[PDB]
Amino acid sequence: QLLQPLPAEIKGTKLLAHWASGATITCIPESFLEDEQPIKKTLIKTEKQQNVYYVTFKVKGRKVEAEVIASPYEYILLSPTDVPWLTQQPLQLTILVPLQEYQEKILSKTALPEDQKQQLKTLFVKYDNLWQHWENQVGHRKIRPHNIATGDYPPRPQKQYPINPKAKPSIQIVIDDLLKQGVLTPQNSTMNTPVYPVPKPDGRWRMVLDYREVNKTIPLTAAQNQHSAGILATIVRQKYKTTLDLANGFWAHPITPESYWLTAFTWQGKQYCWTRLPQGFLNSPALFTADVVDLLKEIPNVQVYVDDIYLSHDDPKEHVQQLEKVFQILLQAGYVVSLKKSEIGQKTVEFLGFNITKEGRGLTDTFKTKLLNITPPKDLKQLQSILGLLNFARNFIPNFAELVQPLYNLIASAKGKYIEWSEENTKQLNMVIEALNTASNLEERLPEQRLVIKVNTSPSAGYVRYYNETGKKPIMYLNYVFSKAELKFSMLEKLLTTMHKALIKAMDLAMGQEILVYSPIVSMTKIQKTPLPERKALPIRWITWMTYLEDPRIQFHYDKTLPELKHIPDVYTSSQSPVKHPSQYEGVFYTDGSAIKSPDPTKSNNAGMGIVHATYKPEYQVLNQWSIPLGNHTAQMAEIAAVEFACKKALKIPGPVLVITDSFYVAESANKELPYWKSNGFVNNKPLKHISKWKSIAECLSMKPDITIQHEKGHQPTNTSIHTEGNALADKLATQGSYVVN
Ligand SMILES: [Ca+2]
């Protein structure tokens, strides 16, 4: 548990002892007390009677004589009396995690009222032993050790190839910590497993075991929890939502001493074995999750997939009451929670087993059906991709040949491998999409025909088409938004996470009908054999992906007519179409800019912008004011540079903010022109200072998209809205700076 294990040898074989606090005598693993003769026989309430012995053993090299009983466990429960010299000391591993930055981060983003928010800040301390304090820290689970030695024909040992030495230092720490905790034991074995290193965003590296050779031997003989699909159907979305990431829980379940040889691996010419369940093993996710489910059975609403846990209660007070009940269970069992990726008491959770963020109160996940806009292609190869993409809608769209005709005429126009794109063509393309958004082309779902799903993906997002098996029109298209982590995935994994998000909505439309999925992938079996270093997603992703093949209701077919969508341009995402109230934003930024006639005839101009930071959470208040002269520039430039300053100051505040411009051109450009100027490369603006200002705004929004931009004329507004009052102050500051000369 929280006490550091102590190295000890009893009968030649090394073992570990744990300082106990109970007054009961020392327990010893059962396999050593068979040969020994019993002194007497006593019964224990917490009544079964067991034999009593008196054996000698070494603790840290010093022999110890004590009256002992048996223990079904693999550790030596050490009575404090028998060892008066040795004192209890807490566990001390290598690296201490930044636990205070984690808790302050969770307290910041919590959507709970300040009343319950202080209860949580108190719950950090009462259950301090529950959170993960050390890196690679694991907990002990007082459970009957698992037997994973199923199957009479053992697998063949794999030779260990040299690995990257740049990863050895960061991994040897983990080897030391697990050895220190007894998670790893030095022991030769018949089986050997390859080990692979993969980098971590912080610069260090984590090791990966290749257990697919042992999994082909071990048969599937365990009760599987509801899979990704079955869990997501029974969920209950209430007011607040909370997710708790465990610290590799399979490292908490110990395996039987007989099964240690199976999990063996070679590190630095030395062979080690696993005391606990290892990650990448066949039955580790199932054996671990089942235990977790029983504990969470008592809670009214819960869902557990792998490490992640889900809790959603509508009552603010009851969410915290159940949350404390969750913590006691996890602390009493010996589980360890990582506050690095945990999310507590938020209106939406970023990840709940599935990659989709969960908002609202809906038992079934909802997502936008309609396809999204596409940025103009920069090259011919990116324009040929989108044409062969729309080729499917020829057989059921009347105006198709008429609305696509202009784009065909544009390709042969230049004939110089460079293509010129007109702004109206961008609007024409937007019309092509709106035709698909119209429910005419949308066929109706038929409960008789099976559900056909055609899946392809672009570097920016995926494209999913739900069909009827005979129908020429699709029931409904589906376009999934890639998260910042999924964009890092390889192209093959972008398809798989796309299919994952597509089979979710298919369950709603299945209605007891088998589902056939067509995909550019030729063989599903070959995909499981895809090499490991090419997978750039978490194993939780692949397990979640592979668990869907086993369903006989779903079948996957290779489709040749699916085109290549690697050169598909970026999907146009609009953060301005949703409008949010100014009170819910954490920060409000009013901007403005003026430019009177310069006194000097040479400059001929003078500018001055104004910035106001306002917060509406408690009442209408202003944090700071700013009034800056900009020299000879455009009045709109003063209104252009006014938001570049405001965009930066929002980065220091992690939360929803809103910037407001008196200018029409600024807000409209940030909504439609900015997604263009990014891909446009700022071509044919405007000399160089003008372009640098727009890029800086684009990059600032790239680092934090939580920034929304509105626009309000505010011409002689007596008291139109409570919002225009703050903008009247910003225009005052912009005017003051415009009147000041250097
Ligand atoms: Ca202005």
Numbering used by the authors: 7 to 52, 56 to 694, 697 to 753
Excerpt from the paper describing this PDB structure:
A cleavage between the N-terminus of integrase (IN) and the C-terminus of the RNase H domain of RT produces mature IN and PR-RT from the Pol polyprotein. The mature PR-RT has all of the enzymatic functions of PR and RT [reviewed in]. The PR-RTs of FVs are monomeric in solution and the RT component is responsible for converting the (+) FV ssRNA genome into dsDNA for integration into the host chromosome.
In an effort to further investigate the structure and maturation of retroviral Gag-Pol and Pol polyproteins, we have determined and report here the crystal structure of the wild-type full-length PFV PR-RT protein at 2.9 Å resolution. The PR-RT we crystallized has a mutation in the active site of PR. Despite differences in the unit-cell parameters, particularly along the x-axis, the structures of CSH and WT PR-RTs are highly superimposable (RMSD = 0.785 Å). Unless specifically indicated, the results we discuss here are from the WT protein structure. The connection subdomain is further tilted slightly towards the polymerase active site such that it sits almost parallel to the palm of the RT compared to its position in the p66 subunit of HIV-1 RT where the two subdomains are orthogonal. This compact fold allows helix L (K in HIV-1 RT) to pack against H, while helix O (L in HIV-1 RT) tilts towards the active site loop positioning T552 of PFV RT to form a hydrogen bond with Y314, and T556 with H236, while H507 forms a bifurcated hydrogen bond with S237 and N364. In the WT PFV PR-RT structure, there is a calcium ion from the crystallization buffer (which contains 100 mM Ca2+) that is chelated by the side chains of residues D601, E648, and D671, which define the RNase H active site. These residues are positional equivalents of D443, E478, and D498 of HIV-1 RNase H. In the PFV PR-RT structure, the RNase H domain occupies the opposite side of the DNA-binding cleft, with the active site pointing away from the putative nucleic acid-binding cleft.
